[PDB]
Coordinates of all heavy atoms in Angstrom, one line a residue:
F5 N 1.8 5.2 1.1 CA 1.9 6.0 2.3 C 0.7 7.0 2.4 O 0.5 7.8 1.5 CB 3.2 6.6 2.4 CG 3.4 7.4 3.7 CD1 3.9 6.8 4.9 CD2 3.1 8.8 3.8 CE1 4.0 7.5 6.0 CE2 3.3 9.5 4.9 CZ 3.8 8.8 6.1
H6 N 0.0 7.0 3.5 CA -1.1 8.0 3.7 C -0.6 9.1 4.6 O 0.0 8.9 5.7 CB -2.3 7.2 4.4 CG -2.7 6.0 3.6 ND1 -3.1 6.1 2.3 CD2 -2.8 4.7 4.0 CE1 -3.4 4.9 1.9 NE2 -3.3 4.0 2.9
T7 N -0.9 10.3 4.1 CA -0.5 11.6 4.8 C -1.7 12.0 5.7 O -2.8 11.5 5.6 CB -0.2 12.7 3.8 OG1 -1.4 13.0 3.1 CG2 0.9 12.3 2.9
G8 N -1.4 12.9 6.6 CA -2.4 13.5 7.5 C -2.7 12.8 8.8 O -3.6 13.1 9.5
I9 N -1.9 11.8 9.1 CA -2.0 11.0 10.3 C -1.1 11.7 11.4 O 0.0 12.0 11.2 CB -1.5 9.6 10.2 CG1 -2.4 8.9 9.2 CG2 -1.6 8.8 11.6 CD1 -2.0 7.4 8.9
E10 N -1.8 12.0 12.5 CA -1.1 12.5 13.7 C -1.6 11.7 14.9 O -2.7 11.9 15.3 CB -1.3 14.0 13.9 CG -0.8 14.9 12.8 CD -0.9 16.4 13.1 OE1 -1.9 16.7 13.8 OE2 -0.2 17.2 12.5
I11 N -0.7 10.9 15.5 CA -1.1 10.1 16.6 C -0.7 10.8 17.9 O 0.4 10.7 18.4 CB -0.5 8.7 16.5 CG1 -1.0 8.0 15.2 CG2 -0.8 7.9 17.7 CD1 -0.2 6.9 14.7
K12 N -1.7 11.5 18.5 CA -1.5 12.3 19.7 C -1.9 11.4 21.0 O -1.2 11.6 22.0 CB -2.4 13.5 19.7 CG -1.9 14.6 18.8 CD -2.8 15.7 18.6 CE -2.4 16.7 17.6 NZ -3.3 17.8 17.4
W14 N -2.1 7.8 22.5 CA -1.8 6.4 22.4 C -1.3 5.8 23.6 O -0.7 6.5 24.5 CB -0.9 6.2 21.2 CG 0.5 6.7 21.4 CD1 0.9 8.0 21.4 CD2 1.7 6.0 21.7 NE1 2.2 8.1 21.6 CE2 2.7 6.9 21.8 CE3 1.9 4.6 21.8 CZ2 4.0 6.4 22.0 CZ3 3.2 4.2 22.1 CH2 4.3 5.1 22.2
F33 N 12.7 2.7 22.9 CA 12.0 2.2 21.7 C 11.0 3.3 21.3 O 10.8 3.7 20.1 CB 11.2 0.9 22.1 CG 10.1 0.6 21.1 CD1 10.3 0.0 19.9 CD2 8.7 0.9 21.5 CE1 9.2 -0.3 19.1 CE2 7.7 0.6 20.7 CZ 7.9 0.0 19.4
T34 N 10.3 3.9 22.3 CA 9.3 4.9 22.1 C 9.9 6.1 21.4 O 9.4 6.7 20.5 CB 8.6 5.4 23.3 OG1 7.8 4.3 23.8 CG2 7.7 6.6 23.0
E35 N 11.1 6.5 21.9 CA 11.9 7.6 21.3 C 12.2 7.4 19.9 O 12.0 8.2 19.0 CB 13.1 8.0 22.2 CG 14.1 9.0 21.5 CD 13.4 10.4 21.3 OE1 12.3 10.6 21.8 OE2 14.1 11.2 20.7
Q36 N 12.7 6.2 19.6 CA 13.1 5.8 18.2 C 11.8 5.9 17.3 O 11.9 6.4 16.2 CB 13.8 4.5 18.1 CG 15.0 4.4 18.9 CD 16.3 4.9 18.3 OE1 16.2 5.8 17.4 NE2 17.4 4.3 18.6
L37 N 10.7 5.3 17.8 CA 9.5 5.3 17.0 C 9.0 6.8 16.8 O 8.5 7.1 15.7 CB 8.4 4.5 17.8 CG 7.0 4.5 17.2 CD1 7.1 3.9 15.8 CD2 6.1 3.6 18.1
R38 N 9.2 7.6 17.8 CA 8.7 9.0 17.7 C 9.5 9.7 16.5 O 8.9 10.4 15.7 CB 9.1 9.8 19.0 CG 8.7 11.3 18.9 CD 9.2 12.0 20.2 NE 10.6 12.2 20.2 CZ 11.2 13.3 19.6 NH1 10.4 14.1 18.9 NH2 12.5 13.4 19.6
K39 N 10.8 9.5 16.5 CA 11.6 10.1 15.5 C 11.3 9.7 14.1 O 11.2 10.5 13.2 CB 13.1 10.0 15.9 CG 13.4 10.8 17.2 CD 14.9 11.0 17.4 CE 15.6 9.6 17.7 NZ 17.1 9.8 18.0
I40 N 11.3 8.3 13.9 CA 11.0 7.9 12.5 C 9.6 8.2 12.0 O 9.4 8.5 10.9 CB 11.4 6.3 12.3 CG1 11.3 5.9 10.9 CG2 10.4 5.5 13.2 CD1 11.7 4.5 10.6
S41 N 8.6 8.1 12.9 CA 7.3 8.4 12.5 C 7.2 9.9 12.1 O 6.5 10.2 11.2 CB 6.2 8.0 13.6 OG 6.4 8.7 14.8
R42 N 7.9 10.7 12.9 CA 7.9 12.1 12.7 C 8.6 12.4 11.3 O 8.0 13.2 10.5 CB 8.7 12.8 13.8 CG 9.1 14.3 13.5 CD 10.3 14.7 14.5 NE 11.5 14.0 14.1 CZ 12.6 14.0 14.9 NH1 12.6 14.6 16.0 NH2 13.7 13.4 14.4
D43 N 9.7 11.8 11.1 CA 10.5 12.0 9.9 C 9.7 11.6 8.7 O 9.7 12.2 7.6 CB 11.8 11.2 9.9 CG 12.7 11.7 11.0 OD1 12.4 12.7 11.7 OD2 13.8 11.1 11.2
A44 N 8.9 10.5 8.8 CA 8.0 10.1 7.7 C 6.7 10.9 7.5 O 6.0 10.7 6.5 CB 7.6 8.6 7.9
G45 N 6.4 11.8 8.4 CA 5.2 12.6 8.3 C 3.9 11.9 8.8 O 2.8 12.2 8.3
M46 N 4.1 11.0 9.7 CA 3.0 10.4 10.5 C 3.3 10.4 12.0 O 3.4 9.3 12.6 CB 2.7 8.9 10.0 CG 3.9 8.0 9.9 SD 3.5 6.3 9.6 CE 2.9 5.8 11.3
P47 N 3.5 11.6 12.5 CA 4.1 11.7 13.9 C 3.3 11.1 15.0 O 2.1 11.3 15.2 CB 4.1 13.3 14.1 CG 3.0 13.8 13.1 CD 3.1 12.9 11.9
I48 N 4.0 10.2 15.7 CA 3.5 9.6 16.9 C 4.1 10.4 18.1 O 5.3 10.4 18.2 CB 3.8 8.1 17.0 CG1 3.2 7.3 15.9 CG2 3.4 7.5 18.4 CD1 3.7 5.9 15.7
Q49 N 3.3 11.0 18.9 CA 3.9 11.8 20.0 C 4.7 11.0 21.0 O 4.4 9.8 21.2 CB 2.8 12.7 20.7 CG 2.1 12.0 21.8 CD 1.3 13.1 22.6 OE1 0.8 14.1 22.1 NE2 1.3 12.9 23.9
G50 N 5.7 11.6 21.6 CA 6.7 10.9 22.4 C 6.1 10.4 23.7 O 6.6 9.4 24.2
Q51 N 5.1 11.0 24.2 CA 4.6 10.6 25.5 C 3.3 9.8 25.4 O 2.2 10.4 25.1 CB 4.3 11.8 26.4 CG 3.9 11.5 27.8 CD 4.9 10.7 28.6 OE1 6.1 10.9 28.5 NE2 4.4 9.7 29.3
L80 N -4.6 4.6 19.4 CA -3.8 3.4 19.1 C -3.3 2.8 20.4 O -2.9 3.5 21.3 CB -2.6 3.8 18.3 CG -1.6 2.6 17.9 CD1 -2.3 1.7 16.9 CD2 -0.4 3.2 17.3
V82 N -0.3 0.2 21.4 CA 0.9 -0.6 21.0 C 1.1 -1.7 22.0 O 1.3 -1.4 23.2 CB 2.2 0.3 20.8 CG1 3.4 -0.6 20.5 CG2 1.9 1.3 19.7
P120 N 16.2 0.5 12.4 CA 15.4 1.4 11.5 C 14.4 0.5 10.7 O 13.3 1.0 10.5 CB 16.4 2.0 10.6 CG 17.6 2.1 11.5 CD 17.6 0.8 12.3
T122 N 12.9 -2.5 11.4 CA 11.8 -3.0 12.2 C 10.9 -1.8 12.6 O 9.7 -2.0 12.6 CB 12.2 -3.8 13.4 OG1 13.1 -3.1 14.2 CG2 12.9 -5.1 12.9
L123 N 11.5 -0.6 12.9 CA 10.6 0.5 13.2 C 9.8 1.0 12.0 O 8.7 1.4 12.1 CB 11.5 1.7 13.7 CG 12.1 1.4 15.1 CD1 13.4 2.3 15.3 CD2 11.1 1.7 16.2
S124 N 10.5 1.0 10.8 CA 9.8 1.2 9.6 C 8.6 0.2 9.3 O 7.5 0.6 9.0 CB 10.8 1.2 8.4 OG 10.1 1.3 7.2
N125 N 8.9 -1.0 9.6 CA 7.8 -2.1 9.5 C 6.6 -1.7 10.3 O 5.5 -1.8 9.9 CB 8.3 -3.4 10.0 CG 9.3 -4.1 9.1 OD1 9.5 -3.7 7.9 ND2 10.0 -5.1 9.6
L126 N 6.9 -1.3 11.6 CA 5.8 -0.9 12.5 C 5.1 0.4 12.0 O 3.9 0.4 12.0 CB 6.5 -0.7 13.9 CG 5.5 -0.2 15.0 CD1 4.3 -1.1 15.1 CD2 6.2 -0.2 16.4
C127 N 5.8 1.4 11.5 CA 5.2 2.6 11.0 C 4.3 2.3 9.9 O 3.2 2.8 9.8 CB 6.3 3.6 10.6 SG 7.0 4.4 12.0
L128 N 4.7 1.4 8.9 CA 3.9 1.1 7.8 C 2.6 0.4 8.2 O 1.5 0.7 7.6 CB 4.7 0.3 6.8 CG 5.7 1.2 6.1 CD1 6.6 0.3 5.2 CD2 4.9 2.3 5.3
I130 N 1.1 0.7 11.0 CA 0.2 1.7 11.7 C -0.4 2.6 10.6 O -1.6 2.9 10.7 CB 1.0 2.5 12.7 CG1 1.4 1.6 13.9 CG2 0.2 3.7 13.1 CD1 2.5 2.2 14.8
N131 N 0.4 3.0 9.6 CA -0.1 3.8 8.5 C -1.3 3.2 7.8 O -2.3 3.9 7.5 CB 1.0 4.2 7.6 CG 0.7 5.3 6.6 OD1 0.2 5.1 5.5 ND2 1.0 6.5 7.1
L134 N -4.5 3.3 10.2 CA -5.1 4.6 10.5 C -5.3 5.5 9.3 O -5.7 6.6 9.4 CB -4.2 5.4 11.5 CG -3.9 4.7 12.9 CD1 -3.5 5.7 13.9 CD2 -5.1 3.9 13.4

Side-chain angles (χ1 to χ4, degrees):
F5 182 87
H6 307 302
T7 60
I9 301 178
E10 297 182 334
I11 297 158
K12 290 173 184 175
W14 69 284
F33 163 80
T34 294
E35 173 62 6
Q36 304 274 28
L37 177 60
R38 178 186 77 82
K39 295 194 288 184
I40 188 174
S41 62
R42 169 196 70 191
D43 295 356
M46 50 171 285
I48 299 170
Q49 86 165 37
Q51 184 61 40
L80 180 70
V82 175
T122 56
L123 292 157
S124 172
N125 290 343
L126 178 48
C127 284
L128 286 173
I130 292 163
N131 193 269
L134 305 198

